């Protein structure tokens, strides 16, 4: 699809995420050309779940404790498509506020940003 | 233009930014679908300008100190265009880390994401 850019209506799509840790879930995600890497909420993961620590640069500076990194790939299915996007690794939000589809994943969909 | 998305290569543009408080300046700015408003480095404003308070939600949580809002509109010209994007107001980065062209500016270029 073509997704129009609007300050008052975020470009969000529904997305099935498979964390390999528990059954795949549907989330609502922001397509974000300014995210290096994909972000999915910790709530998608089982409690027995080992995650690596990591630095993320955000709007208000570098955060040490807010994001974690997966050890396993994460597969993401977009609406009406059978082939997953597979990310080697991705970011995890401990506060459960960000579900972000970043350029790692849009590269795989062959997504583009188009300026008339 | 069609910008391909790629995790190792930020999608950046050269933009002329007019604070109406010092001479216009051409800066490199991140093209960013995940931003509700544009962000401009405090360095581009006369150190003598009034700026309103505001709260922004970033990857590391809400911040109330880091971004101000502009008192005056901001004009932004992109490569090869006489006619400016006009922003009623926008965010100002107090630490000069970021120049981000956000959904406000991109609506006025009528940019779209496209997912094949």
């Amino acid at each position: 699809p073509v997704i129009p850019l609007d300050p008052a209506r975020r470009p969000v799509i529904k997305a099935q995420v498979d964390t390999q840790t528990s059954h795949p879930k549907t989330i609502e995600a922001l397509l974000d050309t300014g995210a290096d890497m994909t972000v999915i909420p910790i709530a998608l993961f089982s409690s027995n779940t080992p995650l690596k620590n990591t630095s993320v640069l955000g709007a208000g500076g570098q955060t040490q404790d807010h994001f974690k990194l997966t050890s396993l790939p994460v597969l993401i299915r977009l609406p009406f498509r059978t082939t997953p996007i597979v990310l080697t690794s991705c970011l995890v939000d401990t506060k459960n506020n960000w579900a972000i589809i970043g350029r790692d994943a849009l590269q795989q969909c062959q997504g583009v940003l188009y300026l008339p | 233009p069609v910008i391909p998305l790629d995790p190792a290569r930020r999608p950046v543009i050269k933009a002329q930014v007019d604070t109406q408080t010092s001479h216009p300046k051409t800066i490199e700015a991140l093209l960013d679908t995940g931003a509700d408003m544009t962000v401009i480095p405090i360095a581009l404003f006369s150190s003598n300008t009034p700026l309103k308070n505001t709260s922004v939600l970033g990857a590391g949580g809400q911040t109330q100190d880091h971004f101000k809002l502009t008192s005056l509109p901001v004009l932004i010209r992109l490569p090869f265009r006489t006619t400016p994007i006009v922003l009623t107001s926008c965010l100002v980065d107090t630490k000069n880390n970021w120049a981000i062209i956000g959904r406000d500016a991109l609506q006025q270029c009528q940019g779209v994401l496209y997912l094949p």
Partner: peptide, 9 residues
């Protein structure tokens, strides 16, 4: 770090 970019209120 990787960068992740901005929301209102």
């Amino acid at each position: 770090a990787p960068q992740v970019x901005v929301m209102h209120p």
